Write a protein that binds this ligand. Structure first.
Ligand code: A1IJB
Ligand code: A1IJB
Ligand code: A1IJB
Lengths: 129, 123, 123
């Protein structure tokens, strides 16, 4: 037996530095667990208030910019977080978007970052059960 | 002209495959995708290539998520007009592959997204 | 308040550079991007930063793909209105850098995609 839902929706992408100066991780595996733990805590706290849980897929990365602006040679250690508003769990896309933005700001604070990006992209989600 | 890209997220089912690292689980999914993409190409003459990335997916521990996230793989690809003449048939093929990956990886659930994109291909 | 993001996928040419791990190949591509982006900024006043991710790309072994996939790097970035005034010129700059990366990495083929996105920038 099987079920499939298709619909138009939004995905998000967030990019954050990982302040090695403060957290002292030794590998991309370790920094992935660091950010995963922080996200898990803040997402749970928000869900308990609003009944909106924002799950995130987290990927290891480095971000390259001008060394004159503080970038290490070959790039700064970063993590990329992405997720989609699944109609199985989301009834109001505007409130979901507001929740993502709030979580992005909290992550910026917890990771002690000067700057952070949060993007929304239109997507067609097929969800299989 | 516009085309489509796809993105799939899958678990790696340590209970069934018993991988010991993110490197090993990346190669596992790579090999499975290679087999199922070839099998579909033999039927339809459409080959769907995939870029695969290591990841962890974070959700509520009450729903079965490990502490700090579940080991996952992200697969993405694009409909390249060099190889694709019919976008509808390509889309149908991706959906078939997404279902087959869900089956082969023994996953309860699976996401497959389509996004509009403008592809520049340099050869 | 829409802008564009880009995605590039490149091989890492073990035949030429002889890297021994995904960590080493990530630093290789990062260093090359850093140099070419700086050079272009000095000419055009457009700096294209990139997020770089480790990956493998899976295609038919009959076409040269290793078993379980080819080692690749994925580069993404977004046109931030804080720094960019003209989206057409930014896109032209990305395309030039994508071609230069193809040349420096000695790749036969390369993809560069553009996707519409809504950027929130927090400072
Ligand atoms: C790697 S798959 C594992 C879980 O990983 C998350 N996940 C999977 N793919 C994605 C994706 N592309 N982007 C973001 N998160 C994703 C999802 O939370 C997914 O949960 P399932 O869809 O499998 O739901 C299983 C059950 O868990 C509950 N649940 C899961 N997510 C939510 C949620 N967001 N809100 C409420 N309930 C939720 C609900 O009972 C549901 O039937
Ligand atoms: C990392 S580059 C390596 C290969 O990796 C795959 N690839 C590269 N970039 C991407 C990307 N963004 N998303 C998904 N797959 C990608 C492609 O399959 C690519 O093949 P090439 O474009 O280099 O074609 C090489 C030759 O191989 C054949 N070929 C490659 N792909 C297909 C195809 N899909 N259908 C038919 N023939 C195909 C054909 O002879 C072609 O001239
Ligand atoms: C991991 S955050 C680190 C740096 O990483 C880059 N970065 C962050 N998120 C992303 C992303 N999603 N995609 C691509 N690059 C990104 C950005 O270059 C960022 O720079 P900041 O926004 O923090 O600016 C810091 C300062 O650096 C200068 N600056 C940074 N980027 C540019 C730029 N593109 N052009 C000119 N000046 C730039 C400017 O003075 C600014 O006040």
């Amino acid at each position: 037996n099987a079920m499939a839902h298709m619909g138009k929706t939004l995905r998000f992408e967030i990019v954050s530095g990982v302040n090695k100066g403060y957290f002292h991780t030794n590998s991309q595996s370790e920094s992935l667990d660091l950010v995963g733990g922080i996200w898990q805590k803040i997402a749970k706290e928000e869900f308990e208030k609003s009944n909106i849980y924002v799950s995130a897929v987290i990927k290891p990365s480095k971000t390259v910019y001008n060394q004159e602006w503080g970038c290490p040679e070959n790039g700064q250690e970063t993590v990329v977080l992405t997720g989609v508003a699944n109609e199985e769990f989301v009834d109001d896309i505007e409130k979901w978007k507001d929740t993502v933005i709030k979580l992005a700001k909290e992550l910026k604070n917890q990771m002690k970052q000067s700057t952070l990006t949060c993007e929304f992209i239109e997507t067609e989600l097929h969800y299989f059960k």
